[PDB]
Design an enzyme around this catalytic site. Structure first.
Site, PDB file in Angstrom:
ATOM      1  N   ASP A   1       0.800  -1.220   0.000  1.00 23.39           N
ATOM      2  CA  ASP A   1       0.000   0.000   0.000  1.00 23.39           C
ATOM      3  C   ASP A   1       0.839   1.279   0.000  1.00 23.39           C
ATOM      4  O   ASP A   1       0.491   2.225  -0.691  1.00 23.39           O
ATOM      5  CB  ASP A   1      -0.965   0.043   1.195  1.00 23.39           C
ATOM      6  CG  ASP A   1      -2.065  -1.013   1.121  1.00 23.39           C
ATOM      7  OD1 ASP A   1      -2.118  -1.779   0.138  1.00 23.39           O
ATOM      8  OD2 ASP A   1      -2.873  -1.076   2.072  1.00 23.39           O
TER       9      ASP A   1
HETATM   10  N1  LIG Z   1       1.171   2.236  10.335  1.00 22.33           N
HETATM   11  C1  LIG Z   1      -0.056   2.257  10.881  1.00 22.33           C
HETATM   12  O1  LIG Z   1      -0.205   2.807  11.959  1.00 22.33           O
HETATM   13  C2  LIG Z   1      -1.291   1.665  10.300  1.00 22.33           C
HETATM   14  C3  LIG Z   1      -2.391   1.259  11.074  1.00 22.33           C
HETATM   15  C4  LIG Z   1      -3.511   0.705  10.445  1.00 22.33           C
HETATM   16  C5  LIG Z   1      -3.490   0.589   9.046  1.00 22.33           C
HETATM   17  N2  LIG Z   1      -2.415   0.985   8.299  1.00 22.33           N
HETATM   18  C6  LIG Z   1      -2.471   0.804   6.853  1.00 22.33           C
HETATM   19  O2  LIG Z   1      -1.728  -0.390   6.598  1.00 22.33           O
HETATM   20  C7  LIG Z   1      -0.949  -0.362   5.418  1.00 22.33           C
HETATM   21  C8  LIG Z   1       0.563  -0.412   5.646  1.00 22.33           C
HETATM   22  O3  LIG Z   1       1.255  -0.548   4.409  1.00 22.33           O
HETATM   23  P1  LIG Z   1       2.491  -1.559   4.079  1.00 22.33           P
HETATM   24  O4  LIG Z   1       3.016  -1.366   2.529  1.00 22.33           O
HETATM   25  O5  LIG Z   1       3.557  -1.473   5.327  1.00 22.33           O
HETATM   26  O6  LIG Z   1       1.738  -3.005   4.274  1.00 22.33           O
HETATM   27  P2  LIG Z   1       0.513  -3.612   3.395  1.00 22.33           P
HETATM   28  O7  LIG Z   1       0.137  -2.555   2.225  1.00 22.33           O
HETATM   29  O8  LIG Z   1      -0.616  -4.211   4.432  1.00 22.33           O
HETATM   30  O9  LIG Z   1       1.191  -4.891   2.648  1.00 22.33           O
HETATM   31  C9  LIG Z   1       1.899  -5.857   3.428  1.00 22.33           C
HETATM   32  C10 LIG Z   1       2.543  -6.863   2.481  1.00 22.33           C
HETATM   33  O10 LIG Z   1       3.432  -7.700   3.190  1.00 22.33           O
HETATM   34  C11 LIG Z   1       3.628  -8.913   2.497  1.00 22.33           C
HETATM   35  N3  LIG Z   1       4.082  -9.913   3.464  1.00 22.33           N
HETATM   36  C12 LIG Z   1       3.375 -10.427   4.491  1.00 22.33           C
HETATM   37  N4  LIG Z   1       4.138 -11.310   5.152  1.00 22.33           N
HETATM   38  C13 LIG Z   1       5.348 -11.362   4.561  1.00 22.33           C
HETATM   39  C14 LIG Z   1       6.531 -12.068   4.790  1.00 22.33           C
HETATM   40  N5  LIG Z   1       6.650 -12.936   5.804  1.00 22.33           N
HETATM   41  N6  LIG Z   1       7.583 -11.858   3.965  1.00 22.33           N
HETATM   42  C15 LIG Z   1       7.523 -10.986   2.942  1.00 22.33           C
HETATM   43  N7  LIG Z   1       6.398 -10.296   2.718  1.00 22.33           N
HETATM   44  C16 LIG Z   1       5.312 -10.461   3.493  1.00 22.33           C
HETATM   45  C17 LIG Z   1       2.212  -9.290   2.138  1.00 22.33           C
HETATM   46  O11 LIG Z   1       2.086 -10.003   0.918  1.00 22.33           O
HETATM   47  P3  LIG Z   1       2.316 -11.598   0.656  1.00 22.33           P
HETATM   48  O12 LIG Z   1       1.004 -12.323   1.334  1.00 22.33           O
HETATM   49  O13 LIG Z   1       2.430 -11.762  -0.966  1.00 22.33           O
HETATM   50  O14 LIG Z   1       3.728 -12.005   1.387  1.00 22.33           O
HETATM   51  C18 LIG Z   1       1.542  -7.920   2.027  1.00 22.33           C
HETATM   52  O15 LIG Z   1       1.464  -7.580   0.638  1.00 22.33           O
HETATM   53  C19 LIG Z   1      -1.315   1.003   4.808  1.00 22.33           C
HETATM   54  O16 LIG Z   1      -2.516   0.690   4.095  1.00 22.33           O
HETATM   55  C20 LIG Z   1      -1.699   1.832   6.031  1.00 22.33           C
HETATM   56  O17 LIG Z   1      -2.572   2.820   5.525  1.00 22.33           O
HETATM   57  C21 LIG Z   1      -1.331   1.508   8.916  1.00 22.33           C
END
Ligand SMILES: NC(=O)c1ccc[n+]([C@@H]2O[C@H](COP(=O)([O-])OP(=O)(O)OC[C@H]3O[C@@H](n4cnc5c(N)ncnc54)[C@H](OP(=O)(O)O)[C@@H]3O)[C@@H](O)[C@H]2O)c1
Ligand SMILES: NC(=O)c1ccc[n+]([C@@H]2O[C@H](COP(=O)([O-])OP(=O)(O)OC[C@H]3O[C@@H](n4cnc5c(N)ncnc54)[C@H](O)[C@@H]3O)[C@@H](O)[C@H]2O)c1
Ligand SMILES: NC(=O)c1ccc[n+]([C@@H]2O[C@H](COP(=O)([O-])OP(=O)(O)OC[C@H]3O[C@@H](n4cnc5c(N)ncnc54)[C@H](O)[C@@H]3O)[C@@H](O)[C@H]2O)c1
Ligand SMILES: [Cl-]
Lengths: 372, 177, 369
Positions: free
Chosen positions: B105
């Site tokens: 994301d």
């Molecule tokens: N930071 C905050 O406080 C917070 C709180 C609530 C929501 N959010 C939201 O959460 C999201 C955060 O973004 P992000 O890019 O850090 O995460 P993300 O958009 O949720 O994507 C996480 C990616 O990690 C990959 N993954 C999971 N386990 C893995 C592993 N063991 N090894 C390698 N890859 C792995 C997954 O795909 P696979 O299944 O293909 O491995 C998944 O695509 C944003 O949408 C943000 O708005 C953030």
């Protein structure tokens, strides 16, 4: 060319301010007027002259709200400010109807418009405005700090010529934002950290910070993410297993709250009774009742050598950084209230629509209606 | 539009072996994988080869405020290596390889567009890097449940696996070069 | 059979206990008898039954010293214990004549024999016995913890949707055992840590833990070159390096002397409101002029904490380490369960403060007149 107002907070133990100097400066650079009550920032080490140097006007309470289109508050405004409210004015801040019934009822009488920060929706556009998350982050951090302060043992594993000392066993009960930050801070300090929550998602997030998920015999969740209605039998079993896990801990940090309800009990008389003397419970849910039956809100009690603390305003302790983050949250929210210096309430906008508790005395929030 | 283009750990190692500027962009996936120590080890290794290494930390990467900071700090990464997106965005065009680690994301170009659910999120310009390598296990979407056009760009290549296992293998592959 | 006796510490707010049950069991197993005052370990959460389970006799205070050769104390023995001592018996604990001159004076009168734990030599060989090291580690840990509690700012850097929180700039002034542990703990919490000391060794130790050493330059071992040109150098320089800091943890101390004033008024006047000072040296005056020992004050928004007895706050692990320090020392006092003091040993020669009532430590003897 809007004028936004920020008062000195009045609630017991509140030292935060809705806007800090630097953020006020940008609102003014942006072409807005800012009326600030005498000494509203002093609780967060932001003196009266700081706001003057930012282009704000420091005035008396009572004069505060004349010509004002936006009230920016940390906690909801008392009666005196509710009476001072003008037609078309928008109240912006935490409201929390379950803990401030009278102030909400009073707000109908004046027929004021209020958007509540706790109802800021959890969609990507509103992330930078999420006041719950920022404030919970402060709370979680300080919860771990206070835990270490009250504990008679080291958090970290220590080895020296005198011998080797095990790390503390810390369990965070309730893993929202506060819980996660509590885990992370206890983990940095060297504690062995364990996590309890009914949501598989929360438990995965705890694992993403090195914590050990406490797994009970019965899983609390099923497909669709729906929480299991547990039988009495199944309920007796979770309790006994958790009682045992909790009994082996040196610190319990409890953070579980539910919007509009008193805090659920996670530590019962019988569970506490099985905690060794020296154990420490830091109950973050005290502000809405507490997860621990021993907890006295605002106090540090010790019964059977179990030290139980129920802090009520952790954000107010970390007032500088808590205020700074909240100010920015509100500043980012002011996007949907101010346009190029102008009072431009985007009623249309979802963030306004989801979070708008009231529109001129009319109560729009479903659960807020039910309670009142 | 474009295509998913898988890459071997060996192919990625050659790309990093000759890179002058590398940026690591970690997400929730790094954290689930607890890959922060291996990622730090990789960054150390590249630096000792004269590679200019940086980390871009997105404001909402992971699942709590400062998630990437607490883990990177744990692993021993220097504060001066951690760049926030206003300071690092203009730099992306001169970045030879951006290694995305368990992020989705926060590196999605769709957030620029008003129609997309990610609109509102500050944008990290990893799509302007000369090459992108994305480490994720497979087809798992992010928090927001939207597909990522970054993964389909000409200059993006997919390094499939668990984050720490992969990084471990990258280090070993790089040590052989 | 060597009998060891352990009292209930009685000094104001002292919660440590000289031996903990698990150390008692090592002694009993090694052939020694052990008597422990009713309720001695309650400050450190060891109840009477725990000492009983370890093989010791839990007795009433007036009974504690019947037949005992060794009296192990945390803080010096009060007079009621001093008087009940047998001939041949040896008191083992912290003494420090300055807080307790009249109790030390009382010990020589009774013609008792005492080993002062602060007179353990500060060398690698002795570190298993070094009670100063262990207890200062506790103090340094809790200093950082308190600094974080009192600060209105985060220690760690945090990149969040609501902006980027920068790390707290923490300066540990005086980097001994306490200070270094204060560095490690502030560092664990994500702070940027800086380190000031008059000794380059302390500075290299601090670099090694990841703190930025402050720009010197005096050697001052071991107020020596410190008061060469009378310490205007110290005052001049850090008056600049101190102003940026969000937290100052001060621990500088000189044996038998006033603790150095590292924080004058003109210095604290440059500290930004919200700044926190944690003055560990409070017990011997402060490193900071504003310190009120045992209290938190706030002047001009500068929160100054002068903690006394941090080890007592961390009563479980302070007592544990202390008990192990004594156990290890007791190897120079016990032979297969027999009272066998090693008068010859160079650790015992350094730390034996008096024998048969005669006072053998120079600086101490001088103070008795
Ligand atoms: N930071 C905050 O406080 C917070 C709180 C609530 C929501 N959010 C939201 O959460 C999201 C955060 O973004 P992000 O890019 O850090 O995460 P993300 O958009 O949720 O994507 C996480 C990616 O990690 C990959 N993954 C999971 N386990 C893995 C592993 N063991 N090894 C390698 N890859 C792995 C997954 O795909 P696979 O299944 O293909 O491995 C998944 O695509 C944003 O949408 C943000 O708005 C953030
Ligand atoms: N992000 C979210 O989805 C969400 C949801 C609700 C509240 N919150 C907020 O997040 C913060 C963190 O708290 P939390 O939600 O992580 O706590 P949490 O996820 O642990 O939930 C609260 C408590 O409810 C109890 N519970 C619910 N159903 C039960 C059942 N069937 N049987 C036994 N017990 C049951 C559990 O013991 C649980 O610990 C709170 O301040 C809260 O206001 C967040
Ligand atoms: N095995 C070992 O090598 C070992 C183990 C532990 C301690 N030690 C040594 O024991 C000695 C004393 O340790 P301590 O923790 O009891 O010290 P202490 O309680 O006397 O505190 C003094 C510390 O603060 C510093 N300090 C004193 N005056 C100062 C001033 N005016 N300005 C700036 N800094 C000042 C000192 O240099 C020292 O580092 C140290 O040399 C330590 O290295 C050695
Ligand atoms: Cl305190």
């Amino acid at each position: 060319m809007v004028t936004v107002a920020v008062p000195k907070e009045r609630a017991p133990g509140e030292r935060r301010v809705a806007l800090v100097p630097e953020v006020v400066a940008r609102l003014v650079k942006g072409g807005a007027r800012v009326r600030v009550e005498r000494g509203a920032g002093e609780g967060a080490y932001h003196p009266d002259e700081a706001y003057q140097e930012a282009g704000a006007e420091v005035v008396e309470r009572g004069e505060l709200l004349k010509g004002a289109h936006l009230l920016f508050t940390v906690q909801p405004p008392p009666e005196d400010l509710i009476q001072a409210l003008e037609p078309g004015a928008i109240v912006v801040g935490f409201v929390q109807p379950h803990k401030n019934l009278e102030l909400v009822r009073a707000l109908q009488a004046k027929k004021a418009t209020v958007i509540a920060m706790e109802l800021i929706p959890r969609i990507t556009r509103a992330q930078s405005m999420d006041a719950l998350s920022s404030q919970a982050t402060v709370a979680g951090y300080l919860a771990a700090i206070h835990a270490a302060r009250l504990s008679p043992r080291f958090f970290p594993m220590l080895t020296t010529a005198a011998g080797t000392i095990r790390p503390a066993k810390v369990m965070v009960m309730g893993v929202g934002v506060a819980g996660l930050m509590a885990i992370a801070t206890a983990k940095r300090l060297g504690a062995q950290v364990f996590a309890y929550d009914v949501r598989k998602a929360a438990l995965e997030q705890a694992l993403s910070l090195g914590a050990k998920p406490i797994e009970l015999p019965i899983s609390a969740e099923g497909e669709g993410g729906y929480a299991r209605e547990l039988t009495e039998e199944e309920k007796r079993i979770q309790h006994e297993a958790l009682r045992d896990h909790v009994a082996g801990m040196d610190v319990l940090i409890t953070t579980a709250q539910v919007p509009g309800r008193r805090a659920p009990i996670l530590l019962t008389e019988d569970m506490v009774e099985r905690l060794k003397p020296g154990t420490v419970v830091v109950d973050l849910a005290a502000e809405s009742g507490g997860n621990c039956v021993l907890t006295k809100p605002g106090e540090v009690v010790e019964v059977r050598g179990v030290r139980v603390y129920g802090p009520l305003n952790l954000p107010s302790e970390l007032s500088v950084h808590a205020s700074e983050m909240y100010a920015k949250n509100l500043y980012n929210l002011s996007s949907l209230l101010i346009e190029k210096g102008a009072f431009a309430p985007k009623w249309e906008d979802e963030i306004v629509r989801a979070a708008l508790l009231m529109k001129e005395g009319e109560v729009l929030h479903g659960p807020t209606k039910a309670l009142l | 539009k474009g295509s998913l283009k898988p890459i071997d750990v060996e192919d990625a190692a050659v790309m990093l072996a000759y890179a002058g500027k590398v940026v690591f962009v970690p997400g929730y996936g790094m954290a689930l994988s607890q890959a922060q120590h291996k990622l730090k080890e990789l960054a150390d290794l590249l630096e000792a080869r004269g590679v200019e290494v940086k980390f871009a930390i997105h404001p909402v990467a992971g699942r709590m405020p400062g998630h990437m900071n607490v883990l990177l700090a744990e692993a021993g990464v220097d504060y001066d290596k951690l760049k926030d997106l206003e300071e690092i965005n203009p730099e992306f065009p001169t970045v030879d390889v951006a290694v995305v680690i368990g992020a989705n994301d926060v590196v999605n170009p769709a957030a620029r567009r008003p129609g997309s659910p990610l609109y509102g999120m500050p944008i990290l310009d990893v799509d302007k890097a000369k090459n992108v390598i994305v480490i994720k296990r497979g087809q798992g979407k992010g928090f927001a449940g939207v597909e990522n056009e970054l993964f389909y760009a000409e200059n993006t290549r997919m390094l499939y696996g668990d984050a720490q296992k992969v990084l471990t293998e990258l280090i070993q592959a790089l040590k052989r070069l």
